[PDB]
Scaffold this motif. Structure first.
Motif, mmCIF file in Angstrom:
data_model
loop_
_atom_site.group_PDB
_atom_site.id
_atom_site.type_symbol
_atom_site.label_atom_id
_atom_site.label_comp_id
_atom_site.label_asym_id
_atom_site.label_seq_id
_atom_site.Cartn_x
_atom_site.Cartn_y
_atom_site.Cartn_z
ATOM 1 N N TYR A 1 -14.019 2.566 9.233
ATOM 2 C CA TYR A 1 -14.146 1.126 9.362
ATOM 3 C C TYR A 1 -14.795 0.712 10.700
ATOM 4 C CZ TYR A 1 -12.547 -3.759 9.723
ATOM 5 O OH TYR A 1 -12.468 -5.132 9.826
ATOM 6 N N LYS B 1 0.761 -1.246 0.000
ATOM 7 C CA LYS B 1 0.000 0.000 0.000
ATOM 8 C C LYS B 1 0.777 1.273 0.000
ATOM 9 C CE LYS B 1 -4.236 1.605 2.383
ATOM 10 N NZ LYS B 1 -4.129 2.897 1.642
ATOM 11 N N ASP B 2 0.243 2.286 -0.716
ATOM 12 C CA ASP B 2 0.706 3.662 -0.625
ATOM 13 C C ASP B 2 2.144 3.883 -0.996
ATOM 14 O OD1 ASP B 2 -1.849 4.330 0.104
ATOM 15 O OD2 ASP B 2 -1.449 4.348 2.284
ATOM 16 N N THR C 1 -11.585 0.536 0.574
ATOM 17 C CA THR C 1 -10.552 1.296 1.294
ATOM 18 C C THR C 1 -11.202 2.351 2.161
ATOM 19 O OG1 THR C 1 -8.866 0.694 -0.302
ATOM 20 C CG2 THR C 1 -8.370 2.599 1.081
ATOM 21 N N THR D 1 -5.309 3.140 8.683
ATOM 22 C CA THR D 1 -6.181 2.863 7.543
ATOM 23 C C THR D 1 -6.733 1.468 7.645
ATOM 24 O OG1 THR D 1 -4.358 2.118 6.113
ATOM 25 C CG2 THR D 1 -4.924 4.484 5.976
ATOM 26 N N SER E 1 -10.872 4.780 6.126
ATOM 27 C CA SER E 1 -10.025 5.259 7.213
ATOM 28 C C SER E 1 -10.381 4.299 8.360
ATOM 29 C CB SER E 1 -10.422 6.680 7.594
ATOM 30 O OG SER E 1 -11.728 6.693 8.142
ATOM 31 N N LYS E 2 -9.514 4.168 9.375
ATOM 32 C CA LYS E 2 -9.762 3.325 10.537
ATOM 33 C C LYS E 2 -11.088 3.820 11.197
ATOM 34 C CE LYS E 2 -7.555 2.322 15.024
ATOM 35 N NZ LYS E 2 -6.258 2.526 15.721
ATOM 36 N N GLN F 1 -2.224 -2.851 9.869
ATOM 37 C CA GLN F 1 -2.749 -1.743 9.066
ATOM 38 C C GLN F 1 -3.577 -0.785 9.925
ATOM 39 O OE1 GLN F 1 -5.398 -2.456 5.739
ATOM 40 N NE2 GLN F 1 -4.980 -0.430 4.961
ATOM 41 N N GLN G 1 -4.504 5.472 -6.397
ATOM 42 C CA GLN G 1 -5.348 5.956 -5.304
ATOM 43 C C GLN G 1 -5.693 7.436 -5.505
ATOM 44 O OE1 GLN G 1 -6.066 3.428 -2.828
ATOM 45 N NE2 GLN G 1 -5.216 2.435 -4.673
ATOM 46 N N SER H 1 -8.164 -1.591 4.817
ATOM 47 C CA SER H 1 -8.479 -2.098 3.500
ATOM 48 C C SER H 1 -9.038 -3.459 3.689
ATOM 49 C CB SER H 1 -7.224 -2.213 2.627
ATOM 50 O OG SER H 1 -6.556 -0.973 2.505
#
Lengths: 216, 240, 213
Positions: C186, A144-145, C180, C129, C182-183, C124, A172, C131
């Motif tokens: 989610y 990721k990223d 996808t 974040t 943000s925490k 993660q 993204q 995913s």
């Protein structure tokens, strides 16, 4: 042997310019139109414009007039394409190709292409996260990223390839890229087989090895 | 000011333009060609220029025009035997000499030159390539246009040569000084010479003449194979 | 500009069968049309030009025809190395415009995807974040629908798909759909589900989990 060798991948911030080069060998440079073609990621070919190096005459498709400028250096047998006021939509692979004079200016020899990435993003290595397995199991790594492309991923230092799928990167909204690499394996193998994804991001000198284990 | 060779062909401008119009009429895939632009580029190459100071760069505005399709394996090169080469392509319509292409067709059998200070076409006299100067409008046109046509040739490149000449293969002809050196070995397997017994009856195997063995040697050093055929009866060759 | 239209974006074929690709020009381009082949990560390659001409050494299984505004490119017997994208182009008058391309893929028996869902890792989530990855593995045909559902609600605009090239050995595709978040976004819901529709499935397959378990 006719060859067209293009300059290396470019990364540019928005509003800046870039000058790409195409070095010709194996034929009389001045006597053939050199044409350029754009290919946005995952999209089709688009004809940009052309230069006749013998007299410097040029022409461009309407879409690219004011964006592309072609010039030629007869001494170095090189054609240059200058792209101005760069925006995200200019990110693409740019090919130079020779017009076959006795082929009605169809494109007979092509360069290997130059990737141009236009973004406000700065060089950044990926964060690698496990996709834990939870009679066939699947597991993987989320890469990721990162910026810019490319990233390469192998499993078990290249010893594991059967059932591996590494997906193409996705751009993204941040201008960074992400992808996952996955593997399907026998579920009975999970307690006796180690799975490590090896990620390499040459632009940031980032190399990561992630062990992917079943979640406790 | 005064030259040893004949002057520009009478009504040369009308001839060049009519030829362009006729060529693009016969070949509909060429109707996109702007014949005014062709004449303007041809005229611009030599008008107001000293006719011994002409370079390949002067012809580049004309060279860029007239792109067309000539299959690489259908090219016929020739040296000092113009009439037989053109009769052959008039019969075998798929094959092309340079004078069967647009640029060659425009200039075939014509002479032209200008004067440095004026916009006048010199109709009185033009430089003789051997007596006056080699860098003249006519010689520079053929040498520049020919190189690209030779670069195009592939597989077996055929060349018609005049066997009645003192030098069947002349190292200093357009074929010998330009075309031979632009044949690409990555594309060209063989150069096949057809030695024409045009004039007097010559029962000799003219493919054994020193100039032919010289051509064989030059083409050998460029890693291309050489083949030679005698055309003992050219009049009967056209019917066959 | 002259517009070149290739009406089929994709064509399915079998090894040894013939295939034809059509191209239409918006204006007369006489017989001056070329066809280029392109494989992933490679430059295009000219196969046919001036509608029907073929350079020495290009295989004679490739042919072109047409004049005016209608053109056809045919492969008389598809070989493995011929699976690629084919572009028509008019090279009659500048800009020498290209058609949109036609991808030629190989037919095989229907294969339903095996579907797997992966919650975000604790690593993660610690980074800020989240995913959620939904994997559709080794299926055929390429057409598949993946819908995300979170706490009953159908999602839109927060997922992206990526698909592999057709496998040269088993002729299948694989696909990832990644949700996808943000925490914080989610952690405001419990049920994360990926619903898959595909020819090989009698009814959609849902793979789901409850956040945190």
């Amino acid at each position: 042997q006719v060859q067209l060798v293009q300059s290396g991948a470019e990364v540019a911030k928005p509003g800046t310019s870039v000058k790409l080069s195409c070095k010709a060998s194996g034929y009389t440079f001045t006597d053939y139109w050199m044409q350029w073609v754009k290919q946005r990621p995952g999209q089709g070919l688009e004809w940009i414009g052309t230069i006749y190096p013998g007299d410097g005459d040029t022409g461009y498709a309407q879409k690219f007039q004011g964006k592309a400028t072609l010039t030629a250096d007869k001494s170095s047998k090189t054609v240059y394409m200058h792209l101005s006021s760069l925006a995200s939509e200019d990110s693409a692979v740019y090919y130079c190709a020779r017009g076959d004079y006795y082929g009605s200016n169809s494109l007979d020899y092509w360069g290997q292409g130059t990737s141009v990435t236009v973004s406000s993003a700065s060089t950044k290595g990926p964060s690698v996260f496990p996709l834990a397995p939870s009679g066939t199991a699947a597991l993987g790594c989320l890469v990721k990223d990162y910026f810019p492309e490319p990233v390469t991923v192998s499993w078990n230092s290249g010893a594991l390839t059967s059932g591996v799928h590494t997906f193409p990167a996705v751009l993204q909204s941040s201008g960074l890229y992400s992808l996952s690499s996955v593997v399907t394996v026998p579920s009975s193998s999970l307690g006796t087989q180690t799975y490590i994804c090896n990620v390499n991001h040459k632009p940031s000198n980032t190399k990561v090895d992630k062990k992917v284990e079943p979640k406790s | 000011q005064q030259w040893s060779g004949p002057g520009t062909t009478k009504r040369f401008p009308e001839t060049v333009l009519a030829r362009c119009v006729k060529y693009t009429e016969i070949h509909p895939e060429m109707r996109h060609v702007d014949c005014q632009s062709v004449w303007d580029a041809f005229k611009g190459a030599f008008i107001s220029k000293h006719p011994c100071d002409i370079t390949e760069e002067d012809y580049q505005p004309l060279m860029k025009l007239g792109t067309q399709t000539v299959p690489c394996n259908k090219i016929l090169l020739w040296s000092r035997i113009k009439d037989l080469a053109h009769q052959f392509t008039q019969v075998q319509r798929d094959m092309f000499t340079l004078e069967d292409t647009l640029l060659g067709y425009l200039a075939d059998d014509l002479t032209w030159c200008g004067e440095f200070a004026t916009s006048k076409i010199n109709y009185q006299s033009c430089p003789d390539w051997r007596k006056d100067c080699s860098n003249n409008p006519v010689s520079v046109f053929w040498k520049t246009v020919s190189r690209r046509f030779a670069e195009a040739a592939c597989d077996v490149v055929h060349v018609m040569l005049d066997g009645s000449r003192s030098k069947i293969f002349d190292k200093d002809s357009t074929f010998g000084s330009v075309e031979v050196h632009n044949l690409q070995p990555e594309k060209v397997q063989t150069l096949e010479a057809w030695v024409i017994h045009g004039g007097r009856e010559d029962s000799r195997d003219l493919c054994q003449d020193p100039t032919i063995k010289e051509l064989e040697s030059i083409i050998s050093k460029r890693n291309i194979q050489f083949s030679c055929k005698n055309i003992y009866r050219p009049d009967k060759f056209l019917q066959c | 500009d002259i517009v070149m239209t290739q009406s089929h974006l994709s064509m399915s074929t079998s090894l040894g069968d013939p295939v034809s690709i059509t191209c239409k020009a918006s204006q007369d381009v006489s017989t001056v049309v070329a066809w280029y082949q392109q494989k992933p990560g490679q430059s295009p390659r000219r196969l046919i030009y001036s509608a029907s001409y073929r350079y020495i050494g290009v295989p004679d299984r490739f042919t072109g025809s047409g004049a005016g505004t209608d053109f056809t490119f045919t492969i008389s017997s598809v070989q493995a190395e011929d699976l690629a994208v084919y572009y028509c182009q008019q090279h009659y008058s500048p800009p020498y415009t290209f058609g949109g391309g036609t991808k030629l893929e190989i037919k095989r028996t229907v294969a339903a995807p095996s579907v797997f869902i992966f919650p975000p890792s604790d690593e993660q989530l610690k980074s800020g974040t989240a995913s959620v990855v939904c994997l559709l593995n080794n299926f055929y045909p390429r057409e598949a629908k993946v819908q995300w559902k979170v706490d009953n609600a159908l999602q839109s605009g927060n997922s992206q798909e990526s698909v592999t090239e057709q496998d040269s050995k088993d002729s299948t595709y694989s696909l990832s759909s990644t949700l996808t978040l943000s925490k914080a976004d989610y952690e405001k819901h419990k049920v994360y589900a990926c619903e898959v529709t595909h020819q090989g499935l009698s009814s959609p397959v849902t793979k789901s989990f409850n956040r945190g378990e």
